[PDB]
Design a protein around this ligand. Sequence first.
Ligand SMILES: C=C(C)CNC(=O)[C@H]1N(C(=O)[C@@H](O)[C@H](Cc2ccccc2)NC(=O)COc2c(C)cc(N)cc2C)CSC1(C)C
Lengths: 99, 99
Amino acid sequence: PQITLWKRPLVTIKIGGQLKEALLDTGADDTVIEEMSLPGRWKPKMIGGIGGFIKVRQYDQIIIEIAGHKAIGTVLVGPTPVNIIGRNLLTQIGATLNF
Amino acid sequence: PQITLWKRPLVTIKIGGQLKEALLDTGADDTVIEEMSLPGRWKPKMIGGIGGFIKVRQYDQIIIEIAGHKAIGTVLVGPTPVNIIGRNLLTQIGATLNF
Ligand SMILES: C=C(C)CNC(=O)[C@H]1N(C(=O)[C@@H](O)[C@H](Cc2ccccc2)NC(=O)COc2c(C)cc(N)cc2C)CSC1(C)C
């Protein structure tokens, strides 16, 4: 689709067998989701931005469906205020910024 | 242009006659720039990011160029980690997300 930016660009995602709402975020390098279970091994990571850093769990090779488009990549899980789809998965669904 | 997301979507902006680097950030409602001098009166705002909240100074009706595109709108100034062009100005330059 073409998504305008008058309001937050929220979409439905399917991850880990669950439906969530998430923000398409070109400012985020990484994808970070509120607390949930995911399969496989993980390792701790710190991610930062406005207000500083939070500690998350990094899971690799996670699938995911974003607004009906599948992909695979790293998903960070932790105390994010907002579920965020970052560039690592936006590329895979073919998302670009156009003006 | 069409900006892909394999790298950070960094552009040059012009504000106060000076060129700066900034990030096109669909996850940001507002535009936040590092400490600088802007004319006029300001109002207080708090904004929440990944790590918590910061206090910023809100300046309205500021002339700003984004990747050569002229905008006039609200600019927040404060301890952001990078200069962020948020949706308030992305809409002025006609930006959309597309996939
Ligand atoms: C993996 C990450 C999300 C870490 N990256 C980052 O945090 C990067 N940023 C991003 O990815 C930004 O899009 C974030 C996303 C976000 C939204 C709501 C809660 C938390 C975080 N937005 C913000 O930090 C603040 O955005 C605003 C919001 C959400 C509301 C208002 N009113 C004003 C602003 C500026 C801004 S700083 C950055 C490093 C460029």
